[model samples]
Target: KTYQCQYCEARSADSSNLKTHIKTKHSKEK
Candidate 1:
């Protein structure tokens, strides 16, 4: 099963991939 991001596109995944893509595309944390 794939871990879901529920944000971005889950193009980022897991603890290692959590926020790196988010701050760029979803910017909710920016």
Candidate 2:
């Protein structure tokens, strides 16, 4: 199963990638 990001619903096969996305993409957001 793919990991879905709670903040943006982005899907990734690996959860670590999703965590990176959140740090890079969602860092500006509250």
Candidate 3:
């Protein structure tokens, strides 16, 4: 199966990668 990302055109190979991508990509770091 393929995993998709929100707010962008990104896809992952698995759930964990997707989760990490979203967390780090969209998370607040200021």
Candidate 4:
């Protein structure tokens, strides 16, 4: 299975890593 980031085209076999990527790479700082 593949976990894809909705904000970006990042794919990972681990969903936890994907969520981390989104939080670190995609989420904007306020």
TM-score for each model = 0.41, 0.69, 0.59, 0.63
Write candidate 3's Cα lDDT for 1-30 as tens digits: 776686578888887787778778887421
Instruction: Give the higher-lDDT candidate: 1 or 2.
Output: 2
Best by lDDT: 2
The CA lDDT of each predicted structure is: 0.61, 0.81, 0.73, 0.76
Best by TM-score: 2
In the predicted model 1, the residue pairs found to clash are: none
Each prediction's RMSD over C-alphas, in Å, is 2.6, 2.6, 3.8, 3.1
Which stretches of model 2 miss by more than 4 angstroms? 28-30
lDDT of 1 by residue, 1-30 (tens): 556566645743376566666666687863
- TM-score-best of 2 and 3: 2
Candidate 1 global CA lDDT score: 0.61
* True-structure lDDT of candidate 3: 0.73
If candidate 1 were superposed on the true structure by all CA atoms, what would the RMSD be? 2.6
TM-score of 2: 0.69
